[PDB]
Amino acid sequence: AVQKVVVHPLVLLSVVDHFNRIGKVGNQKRVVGVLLGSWQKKVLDVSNSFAVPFDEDDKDDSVWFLDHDYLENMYGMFKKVNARERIVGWYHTGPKLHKNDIAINELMKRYCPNSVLVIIDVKPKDLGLPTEAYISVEEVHDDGTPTSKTFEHVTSEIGAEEAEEVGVEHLLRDIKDTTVGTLSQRITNQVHGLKGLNSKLLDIRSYLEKVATGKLPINHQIIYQLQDVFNLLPDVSLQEFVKAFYLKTNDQMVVVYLASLIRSVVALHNLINNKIANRDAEKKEG
Amino acid sequence: TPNCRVALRNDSYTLHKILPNKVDPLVSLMMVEKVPDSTYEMIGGLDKQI
Amino acid sequence: AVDTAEQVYISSLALLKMLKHGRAGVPMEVMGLMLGEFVDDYTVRVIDVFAMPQSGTGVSVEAVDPVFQAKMLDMLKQTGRPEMVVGWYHSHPGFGCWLSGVDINTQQSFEALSERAVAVVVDPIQSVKGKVVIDAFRLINANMMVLGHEPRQTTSNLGHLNKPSIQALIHGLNRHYYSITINYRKNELEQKMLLNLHKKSWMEGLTLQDYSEHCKHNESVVKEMLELAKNYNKAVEEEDKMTPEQLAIKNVGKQDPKRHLEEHVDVLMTSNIVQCLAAMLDTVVFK
Amino acid sequence: EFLHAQEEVKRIQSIPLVIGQFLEAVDQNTAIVGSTTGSNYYVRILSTIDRELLKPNASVALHKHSNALV
Numbered sequence A: 001a002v003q004k005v006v007v008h009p010l011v012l013l014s015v016v017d018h019f020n021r022i023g024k025v026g027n028q029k030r031v032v033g034v035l036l037g038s039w040q041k042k043v044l045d046v047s048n049s050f051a052v053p054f055d056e057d058d059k060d061d062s063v064w065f066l067d068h069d070y071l072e073n074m075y076g077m078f079k080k081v082n083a084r085e086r087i088v089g090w091y092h093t094g095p096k097l098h099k100n101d102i103a104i105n106e107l108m109k110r111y112c113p114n115s116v117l118v119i120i121d122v123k124p125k126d127l128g129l130p131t132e133a134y135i136s137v138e139e140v141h142d143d144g145t146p147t148s149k150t151f152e153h154v155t156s157e158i159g160a161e162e163a164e165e166v167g168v169e170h171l172l173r174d175i176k177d178t179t180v181g182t183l184s185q186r187i188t189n190q191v192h193g194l195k196g197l198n199s200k201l202l203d204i205r206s207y208l209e210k211v212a213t214g215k216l217p218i219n220h221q222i223i224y225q226l227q228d229v230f231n232l233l234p235d236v237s238l239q240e241f242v243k244a245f246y247l248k249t250n251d252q253m254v255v256v257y258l259a260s261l262i263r264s265v266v267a268l269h270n271l272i273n274n275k276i277a278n279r280d281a282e283k284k285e286g
Numbered sequence B: 001t002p003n004c005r006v007a008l009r010n011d012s013y014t015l016h017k018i019l020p021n022k023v024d025p026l027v028s029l030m031m032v033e034k035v036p037d038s039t040y041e042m043i044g045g046l047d048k049q050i
Numbered sequence C: 001a002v003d004t005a006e007q008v009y010i011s012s013l014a015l016l017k018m019l020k021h022g023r024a025g026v027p028m029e030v031m032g033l034m035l036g037e038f039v040d041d042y043t044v045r046v047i048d049v050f051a052m053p054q055s056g057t058g059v060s061v062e063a064v065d066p067v068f069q070a071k072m073l074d075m076l077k078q079t080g081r082p083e084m085v086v087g088w089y090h091s092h093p094g095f096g097c098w099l100s101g102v103d104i105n106t107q108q109s110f111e112a113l114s115e116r117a118v119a120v121v122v123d124p125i126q127s128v129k130g131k132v133v134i135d136a137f138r139l140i141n142a143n144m145m146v147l148g149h150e151p152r153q154t155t156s157n158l159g160h161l162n163k164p165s166i167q168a169l170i171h172g173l174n175r176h177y178y179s180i181t182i183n184y185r186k187n188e189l190e191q192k193m194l195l196n197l198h199k200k201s202w203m204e205g206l207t208l209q210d211y212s213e214h215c216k217h218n219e220s221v222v223k224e225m226l227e228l229a230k231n232y233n234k235a236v237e238e239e240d241k242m243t244p245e246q247l248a249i250k251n252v253g254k255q256d257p258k259r260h261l262e263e264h265v266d267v268l269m270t271s272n273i274v275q276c277l278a279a280m281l282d283t284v285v286f287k
Numbered sequence D: 001e002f003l004h005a006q007e008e009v010k011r012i013q014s015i016p017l018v019i020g021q022f023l024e025a026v027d028q029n030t031a032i033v034g035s036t037t038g039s040n041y042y043v044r045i046l047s048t049i050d051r052e053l054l055k056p057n058a059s060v061a062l063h064k065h066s067n068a069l070v
Helices: A011-020 A068-081 A101-110 A162-172 A185-213 A220-230 A242-285 C012-024 C067-078 C101-113 C214-242 C263-285 D002-010
Strands: A005-007 A032-037 A044-046 A049-051 A086-093 A116-120 A132-135 A152-154 A156-158 B005-008 B015-019 C007-010 C031-038 C043-046 C084-090 C118-121 C135-139 C177-184 D018-027 D030-035 D059-062
Touching (some): A011 A032, A011 A049, A011 A086, A011 C012, A032 A068, A086 A101, A162 C012, A185 C263, A242 C214, C043 C084, C084 C101, C101 C135, D030 D059
Parallel strands (some): C007 C043, C007 C177, C084 C118
Antiparallel strands (some): A032 A049, A032 A086, A132 A152, B005 B015, C031 C043, C135 C177
């Protein structure tokens, strides 16, 4: 019953660290570590974490090794330095996940009952794509379909702390993106707010034409999850929109009509005071 | 200077500036600053004491 | 030997360990060890910083059993990468940044055991608005007090990177220790993704301001610039028609010019021209 | 940079702070104020604070460190 997780801006920096702590000699091209958290009531929080030596062979894709003794000491070391933080799960990077992630999860559920994984992106960082989290659930599948795992998605957000947010602003120092914007940042928030829109909409038809052909089998779960999108968008016809839209559009044109009136008197007064001061310095210089 | 105030540093305790406006805290009750409240003739009778 | 061109290279995830461990114990002076690498004589980097458990009070801090440190560094060799330590840190929450009595004793122990061992001071309760007062200091020997102390000007960039304030030069500067310059090792796939996850949005641009309080907010903006326009009518025209001095008390301590009356107009446009145009897209986009 | 300085002055004042009293004014942009914890101070003021509001011993605001008339 996880609503959402809160990833502090510290742990992903430790992943980017440990993505570079192995890349000098390692060709593993995935980083698997241990996620520590603070399960408060219903929302999940992640403050600190660490990593663990893990490898995986591409042949037979079922062989793995976790270091339990390093997990027992270092989590026990963190408990002594901070008896607030505890285990909440694990994490791995790489978009394409290997299939030992059920085998890793079902082992370390002996540590955490509500075990959770967090997928981050180190290289796919160009578009708007945050970190990703799933959940460990065990059902059959749907009704009469064969049994499997089916990691369900839990939505994720990012939240800092008081020093963890003020220390960020001192680091950037390049554009800094001020609060409430002066008509230039706000339009770009609608520009790149829409650049991610059709990128989702191109992605829907790409999976749809993949399954309209029939290569991969269908999932009925996504069908009605897509079907309530199209028969719940509004249709603007008469007396519910076209009356009520002008009632707030002809409302907001009255107050910008003051901006036409007031700002014209502002620059006119600055014109008068300069044309007085110009001709009076001119007539008295000679 | 008698009853002179200075600007003093808080960490090294060194002088910063001589302050003007000699020491008079709570002068709100003093310096009444308004003369017209009553004229002269509205007393009467007791003219010896004036 | 000693230069005046040293720059400690702290990482971004180093400093986030510094403020979080410093804000964790505020009234008890947290205390940890700083791990990095000496790449040459006079540039030192530090990327990952761990912490130590403490048992100290609000003015001094002690330590714990030293079987924790050597067992920690042994386990950090097999995971990630190994290093040797380059200094230490603490938190001075009350005052600013200067090295106390036992702070110089543990500094003499580390520069003799290790090589040079830069110490870092953090005020956790000062880094509040937008700025941090973190600084790093470094002990100088007392024998070379008849010649230069941080001598031998190689460059000229050592003057505008640090200007010691009056509260700093009273305790140890510059007869006991000296200060050192700090830059930030910023790179890619760490800094860009730091802002690709914090100050981002998807639907924030194409979302209405929920007119239950939007046009309600514009009532209390029109009425206050109404009163400023009541104030503006008399003010300028009386000042110009009585005396043309272009000066006193309407110059020295005033606030009602033509700077105050259009910024309320400036807020009222940006809050509404965006809000007008945000309700124009969904008429086309959403059928 | 001018929009930076507007936001900097904006967030210098929205913080938890102490309350002192205005005592005296030296000149333009400098005053003498004493807090409620005794120990009369000497700090500087801002230009946003209107100078025609500070005749009596009025209730003012002070920073915890810079201790100025915020």
